[PDB]
Structure 1
């Protein structure tokens, strides 16, 4: 076929989104069993987010101060607690649409689908990678907080991300579903540095394998290299160094296409220091690093759920 950035089907996550209102602040919550999960800054006014003391702010809130709405039907809140940067609301009704689910903390370079939501209603779905510097390059307007990132394994939804804020550079930051931020970020309206981002080398190689499978072969060169030699050029171009663990993850793709990983590194090497000369690869004029080796295999093998 061809190759597109593909999100997981979002139906199972759609059935879990609700609207959470505290005071005049509304955002999105995730309703699983009899618990609703949402960012704790739902309790902040505009003035509060400059420097919030979340413990002090939450003490002024009671259960009935939290309005939780799914569709035109509301849940009754019978308990609340704050875990790290997330707030957990105990409701009197278990979500009849709860899928089989898990909470996972992903690693940098891994990918996931985002269901962007407003007022508890789904708006769109897109695919994201967790950058090495633990930001994501999303698309998020005011009110999008509480939108969640997830993967699906057959029938099981692994939630890995919930959106909390945008950085000065315009990239996005958030937490796992236990409320622990990815990266060194805090939920406060203050200027925060993400630090140098780097290109996910193993993902770029997976994509070059995807290119070969789909007929794009012009970049295949006549050289080879070593891991240390390639990593010398990786460092110069802000690419993650490649390890034997990464070569092993690329192994299935190597063995299907007959191109040794160190040969694919030599092709990438020449691309890095000679550019693309105005050509394209899989329809892009840049090297794409937001497909994992697993994503490539899924798309080229037609995995279903």
Structure 2
């Protein structure tokens, strides 16, 4: 029993973290096989960030403009290319600790583990959701650029995020491992701001299922709703509209608890309208939206506490 924000074990990723230096700028990089990935802004000074031309900045560098350090060992750079907002540095050595891996672009609402790193040294690990507005509510200080986000399935690491910047509201933005930003953000100094965010309806519903599987039914009611009537309420409280696809995704959790999705929606509609009347759900006084249906199935018992 219990329910916690749980990250994937971080060891396969720790063995891939290195330090990348260009001039006086140091950040983190990711070393797989004979390649090191890092944010391209490693080539900028502070004044560069105000109007950088990356093609122009990069052509001015040689292979030996870059130092890469893995633990106490210097790797020698033998090639370099830009790919969108990342650099791909080729090095003299293949990483002996390279795990089976893939590069994946995750979708808003999905979750992943972040390994916070400084000077190529991992310091901590926590679970984040990709928000509808394409930011994450992370925890990052100076030196954290190039920290990665990932999921693990079987023994394969699916890398999905590399960290690049902080926005004025204190939330975080970055790219996938092809160097393409999540959201409309750019790696240069502008007046960019996070767009208005929304609550992830599917996840809140998944988490209510988790609460039932764990033994709590206090918030259920005798009612049902149509998809359309639910959404009118959803719009008023700044929740994402629920779709038939979201309804089908919740199929297995529905089957395990014997609670129809539209009946769970009626329960959520009542919580939105009346509040929680001083009560908690899985330890929480608010409606949680950072666990997916996959996260709930991974963590909860396959047997409901009836």
User: Into which bin does the TM-score normalised by the smaller protein fall?
Assistant: over 0.9
Quote the offset at 1:242 in angstroms.
0.8
Please give the alpha-carbon distance, in whole angstroms, between the structure 2 residues aligned to 1:110 and 1:70. Answer: 31
CA RMSD between the two structures: 2.2
Pair 189,290 (structure 1): closer, same or farther in 2 beyond 3 Å:
same
Please give the alpha-carbon distance, in whole angstroms, between the structure 1 residues aligned to 2:174 and 2:253. Answer: 32
Quote the offset at 1:301 in angstroms.
4.4
Please give the alpha-carbon distance, in whole angstroms, between the structure 1 residues aligned to 2:5 and 2:191. Answer: 32
- 1:184-235 per-residue CA deviation (whole Å, 9 max, x = no partner) reads 0001122212211111101000000001111222111121111000011111
**Comparing 216-225 with 204-213, which one deviates more in the overlay?**
216-225
- Residue 68 of structure 1 is matched in structure 2 by 68
Is the CA contact 2:114–2:150 (under 8 Å) kept in the aligned structure 1?
yes
**Comparing 86-95 with 277-286, which one deviates more in the overlay?**
277-286
Please give the alpha-carbon distance, in whole angstroms, between the structure 2 residues aligned to 1:62 and 1:13. Answer: 28
- 1:149-206 per-residue CA deviation (whole Å, 9 max, x = no partner) reads 0000011000000000001111100000000000000011222122111111010000
Please give the alpha-carbon distance, in whole angstroms, between the structure 2 residues aligned to 1:147 and 1:303. Answer: 37
**Comparing 234-243 with 203-212, which one deviates more in the overlay?**
234-243
- Segments of structure 1 that go 5 or more residues without pairing to the other structure are none
Pair 302,51 (structure 1): closer, same or farther in 2 beyond 3 Å:
farther
Counterpart of 1:12 in 2: which secondary structure?
Answer: helix
Aligned length: 305
TM-score, normalised on structure 1? 0.98
Pair 195,103 (structure 1): closer, same or farther in 2 beyond 3 Å:
same
Pair 61,142 (structure 1): closer, same or farther in 2 beyond 3 Å:
same
Quote the offset at 1:17 in angstroms.
0.2
Quote the offset at 1:236 in angstroms.
1.1
- 1:16-70 per-residue CA deviation (whole Å, 9 max, x = no partner) reads 0000000010000000000000000001111111221111111111110111001
Is the CA contact 1:86–1:179 (under 8 Å) kept in the aligned structure 2?
yes
